[PDB]
Design an enzyme around this catalytic site. Structure first.
Site, PDB file in Angstrom:
ATOM      1  N   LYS A   1      -3.974  -8.834 -99.448  1.00  0.00           N
ATOM      2  CA  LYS A   1      -3.867  -8.030 -98.226  1.00  0.00           C
ATOM      3  C   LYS A   1      -2.803  -6.930 -98.382  1.00  0.00           C
ATOM      4  O   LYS A   1      -3.042  -5.776 -97.998  1.00  0.00           O
ATOM      5  CB  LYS A   1      -3.629  -8.964 -97.030  1.00  0.00           C
ATOM      6  CG  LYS A   1      -3.137  -8.374 -95.701  1.00  0.00           C
ATOM      7  CD  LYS A   1      -3.853  -7.096 -95.215  1.00  0.00           C
ATOM      8  CE  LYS A   1      -5.333  -7.231 -94.867  1.00  0.00           C
ATOM      9  NZ  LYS A   1      -5.970  -5.841 -94.827  1.00  0.00           N
TER      10      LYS A   1
ATOM     11  N   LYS B   1       4.881  -0.737 -91.931  1.00  0.00           N
ATOM     12  CA  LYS B   1       5.311  -2.110 -92.179  1.00  0.00           C
ATOM     13  C   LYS B   1       4.629  -2.676 -93.435  1.00  0.00           C
ATOM     14  O   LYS B   1       5.271  -3.301 -94.288  1.00  0.00           O
ATOM     15  CB  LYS B   1       5.018  -3.003 -90.961  1.00  0.00           C
ATOM     16  CG  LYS B   1       5.395  -4.480 -91.150  1.00  0.00           C
ATOM     17  CD  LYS B   1       5.025  -5.323 -89.929  1.00  0.00           C
ATOM     18  CE  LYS B   1       5.333  -6.791 -90.173  1.00  0.00           C
ATOM     19  NZ  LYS B   1       4.693  -7.726 -89.180  1.00  0.00           N
TER      20      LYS B   1
END
Lengths: 296, 296, 240, 297
Positions: free
Chosen positions: C114, C183
């Site tokens: 991811k 982020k």
């Protein structure tokens, strides 16, 4: 009459405590290594069983911890230093941390009536021993005047650089520039050699010209041209410093493209196993990729 | 002694005048009328074209915009080279790659013409005062031949190596200037965002390992003042960074810091700051963040 | 379900789902199968799995993609780091809430994949941003670029997803928040530091998105980062 | 009886000329290499002694030269192509150059009454042979309509992308993105492996996820996972393309930080002697530095 405390007695903490003891200042101390406590107790320090006991006895407490996570654990964590301080106590945090780290500790401290100050130092262990450290302080005016006389025993140039987080900030800004300047120098020197310049003439000319920096003055002759990259300022530490800059940039929404790039170049050096060598060893990233030899 | 000037720009004009003040014979041609008239009033002998200056002169000075124009002026149809008498020295002060000058010295040599790179620093004020720093790539014999004439127009005359190595060392120096400034720009904005005064950063960093000539030249005079008029044009610093990247491509030397500095300065140029001193590049970060550094 | 976003529960449940903001909050909340969908480093999950294992608790990283719309439709892509036995166990429950359920590797490799995907999304977008501004400056309509590049080798999902809906519309509401993409790029850099892998493209993408955040664009879709270059150059893309 | 000219007959020029000849269009041609002229003269081309000869005889002239410097020399240099063209002649420059390069040349051409158009192509030599090239044209509307029927023989998708310099522009923007996407992929794959992912796992998952790009689709399985970096698209050429993008950025005052960094990463690969390998071999830069193995073989 004023009481000084030391949460930890490292390479810096010990000579600082001793210099304070030589002025007849009352010094309490705890360190996980007994021998460090014994070293200072011999010069008149009063040993304590733990951090909390140092905290309860002291008016001004010095600490220098490895990162913000450990600061939070030591200060704010279960049975922390903060909970054991009397109100009006000042904590002087010399840890190499982001301003925001210190700002958030100062907040929790302020609620307990405790003053929390960032006061990172430069000068190393030799400066610590001689009492000639440069100390960069982030604090209120009132709190700086409170602690300045004690700071003046352990250091020479004591700067009130701004409010909370400003000591941490100025150190981070200085070290960011050191790292960037070195990263730029590394590729520049390889280019010059490739274009047929001897390192000696680049040193002579650039050293007297507008391209010059302390980075080049400090590193080129001693490390780069010698090819001896032992000692100096570890590539790992310089990299850690660049990371602290990037943390401060993220927290303040300030883009730092040059810093970001320097950080990745030094990561390359670390990838090559050069982390414990002086940071100027990063020139080897380029030498190995190009076959250009600068560090003759 | 017979000096020639192919072109008489902001630099060429005062150089010719300083030579005329020493009673040296100076021939000259320029793209425009008024520049020739300016020096002919000081005692210069005007010529109808480049080819005529070439035939009359022993030492010819030029500073052209790029390697392509050098090519055309020197070697192109009815070029300067074809009109020079053997033993003539051409002193090319053009901001070009070493290879450019190598390529051109090679064609010159077959004619018996000496071709030397002698880029300068100090700007128009240095040109007027005769205090230019001149970095020379040539044989020992050719350097000694031209040195006395160089010594009238400049102060610090460096014999930096053989042909082109002169181009190389200027490129390496100015690359470092540009990188050091780009790094300084973001660093200062970070510091202010973290609550530091520019003055404070100037004091501390100026006395510490982050320091560079970039900071010492620009901080107080341009950045803190907020007056970015004059100095060293952002366009010129950007041009210089481009020449570094050209040299990196030609030598297969990666230049990530230089590459990033170039794009940051391009941002400043995109904002219309190209004519301002290069330190105005800080406005890139000021505009984007809302952080004001350039105040006192 | 510890939390229900867009030890009462612990004691009663066999499989527990959580998605927390960072590794620090994970270790506060945590420290039976625990399925952590939090956006954290593999190492973060590896530390929590070790403490979990000591008291017989299985701890898996199962970050998802597809957003709230995929969550509603039960079509989330779920990337799982676990043992074969533990994946087999939780798979049927995963298959109700998601469509494409990947057993990507052991503990943390789920975090890894991811992170690598979202790094590429961010880099591809950052590259697209400057490319489009260049094209418009050189006299190309965004429409022409979408047509030609969409059919040629410069194409990416980033362009496919953002170009028409956000960039050309100029409506940067919704989508995938610039703060969250930033982020994600940070997590990649954290993984690069921990693994000693240089990430120069990621590093620059991160700083470009930081520029967007500096301009107050953090809650807009990440493709809004094109405004950085629009504001700086004066060039307008985000019409048409 | 439109008259077509070819200044050079490379891997692209030759099949283009042949496709034109098969439509019975008159084709004049010159090339330094003699065998190339003979190849097309066998299909009905009329050979010429030099560039000027082709220029004087032709209405529409095709060229594809290595860079802007050679374009200026060929077109504008002493005894150039421009001086030998009749007014109303159209030059179709398929050279890989910056828009500004083409704009300069169009201005010198315009004063001689010559139309100068950038028409870079994609599809390669196979597309050139099949007549299926994608052609991106920067020109006036009038000039595009003029040349479009001839373009339609040698190519399939003919785009009027904008005015002068826009064909060059769109190509540059596409290839910039290819280069950036590959550079990003390179470090990403190394990171993934270092974190314990197999390349197959990443191909499978990222290929069906938001991180995907044509760069990954084209290169991952064929070059990276195979470890065979022979053929494909040369690293030198991708690097050249990124340089053209930076040239356009400088000329247009558009910062290109991602492009700039991609350029330097590919320079690293060139420094390591990888210039002739497919550009996905740039991953070897990080493999060599880290000891991480991604590419197969």
């Amino acid at each position: 009459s004023i009481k000084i405390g030391f949460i930890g007695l490292g390479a810096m903490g010990k000579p600082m405590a001793i210099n304070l003891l030589k002025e007849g200042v009352t010094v309490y101390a705890f360190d996980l290594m007994e021998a460090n406590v014994a070293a200072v107790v011999a010069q008149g320090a009063q040993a304590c069983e733990n951090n909390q006991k140092v905290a309860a006895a002291s008016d001004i407490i010095f600490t220098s911890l490895p990162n913000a996570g450990i600061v939070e654990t030591v200060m704010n964590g279960p049975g922390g230093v903060l909970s054991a301080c009397k109100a009006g106590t000042v904590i002087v945090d010399m840890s190499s941390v982001s301003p925001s780290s210190t700002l958030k500790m100062a907040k929790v401290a302020a609620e307990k009536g405790i003053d929390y100050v960032d006061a990172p130092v430069s000068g190393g262990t030799k400066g610590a021993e001689a009492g000639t450290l440069t100390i960069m302080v982030g604090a209120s005016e009132a709190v700086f005047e409170k602690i300045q006389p004690v700071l003046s025993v352990i250091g020479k140039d004591i700067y009130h650089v701004g409010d909370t987080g400003a000591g941490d900030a100025v150190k981070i800004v200085n070290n960011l520039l050191l790292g960037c300047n070195m990263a730029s120098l590394a590729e520049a020197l390889v280019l010059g050699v490739k274009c047929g310049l001897k390192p000696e003439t680049m040193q002579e000319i650039i050293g007297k010209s507008s391209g010059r920096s302390y980075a080049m003055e400090a590193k080129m002759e001693k490390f780069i041209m010698s090819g001896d990259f032992a000692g100096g300022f570890a590539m790992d530490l310089q990299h850690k410093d660049l990371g602290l800059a990037l943390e401060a940039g993220k927290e303040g929404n300030v883009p730092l493209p040059m810093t970001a790039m320097a950080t990745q170049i030094f990561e390359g050096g670390r990838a090559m196993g050069l982390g414990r060598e002086d940071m100027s060893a990063v020139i080897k990233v380029w030498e190995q990729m190009t076959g250009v030899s600068v560090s003759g």
